[PDB]
Amino acid sequence: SNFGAISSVLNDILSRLDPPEAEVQIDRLITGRLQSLQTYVTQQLIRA
Amino acid sequence: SNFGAISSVLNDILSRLDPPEAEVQIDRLITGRLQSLQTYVTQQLIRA
Amino acid sequence: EVFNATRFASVYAWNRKRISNCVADYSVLYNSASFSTFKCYGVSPTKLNDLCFTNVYADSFVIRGDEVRQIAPGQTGKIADYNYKLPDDFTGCVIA
Fold first, then answer.
1. Among B20, B23, C21, C43, which residue has the least CB neighbours within 10 Å?
2. Interface contact flag, C88 B20, Cβ < 8 Å
3. Residues in contact with C78: Cβ distance below 8 Å, sequence separation at least 6, in sequence order
4. What effect is documented for mutating residue 2 to K (chains A, B)?
5. How many Cα atoms are found within 13 Å in the side-chain-facing hemisphere of A20?
């Protein structure tokens, strides 16, 4: 998933774009992956 | 709620602004409603 | 033939030149002619050699200097609405 961005993996935007310009795309992917990880942890805690 | 935007519903910003310009406002409303839904299902799972 | 030429097309009747199966480099373009706005969206001009694209499409057209800002993914005006408009998730960039 892209989480509202132009790509999914950070290795793609880091290979085509520059870090000073694609910094907002990396931050959106990190916050998106962190939210999914937080949801999976809460689901695992309920299952536990 | 606005979730840090200029309006609450997407039909208001889509009629005054263009989708290429109000894309950040719609994305903030989506991740804002998704976070509230994640909190609601978390409370519902605890109540269940 | 793609840069520093003498005859191009219009903005509505442009040609899609097929540029494929070759070595597309950007460092060998500064010695031919000077570029005014080497702006690029969605791709960095310095990372063109590390990666490799596929079936590069060449869209050349001559416009006015006042309309140089309308060539962007998500602009509005007379070229971004009634003429060839760049897509939102558009990969690739423009040399003007």
1. C21
2. yes
3. C67, C70
4. In strain: Omicron/BA.1, Omicron/BA.2, Omicron/BA.2.12.1, Omicron/BA.2.75, Omicron/BA.4, Omicron/BA.5, Omicron/BQ.1.1, Omicron/XBB.1.5, Omicron/EG.5.1
5. 3
**What is the experimental method?**
cryo-EM
Map residue C17 onto helix, strand or coil: strand
Whole-number Å distance between alpha carbons of C9 and C6? 11
Contact at CB, A17 and C50, closer than 8 angstroms: no
Q: Are the beta carbons of C79 and C11 closer than 8 angstroms? A: yes
Half-sphere CA count of B43, side-chain side, radius 13 A: 5
Q: Is the backbone of residue C74 left (phi > 0), alpha (psi -120 to 50) or beta? A: left
**Least Cα separation, residue B4 to chain C (angstroms):** 23
Whether B33 and chain A come into contact, CB under 8 Å, resolves to no
- Rounded to whole angstroms, the Cα distance separating C60 from C32 reads 17
What's the rounded Cα separation, in Å, for the pair B48 and A8? 35
A35 contacts in chain B (CB < 8 Å): 35, 38
Listed resolution, Å: 4.8
Residues 6+ apart with CB under 8 A from C55: C18, C20
Distance CA C42, CA A17 (A): 6
Q: How far apart are CA A44 and CA C14, in angstroms?
A: 56
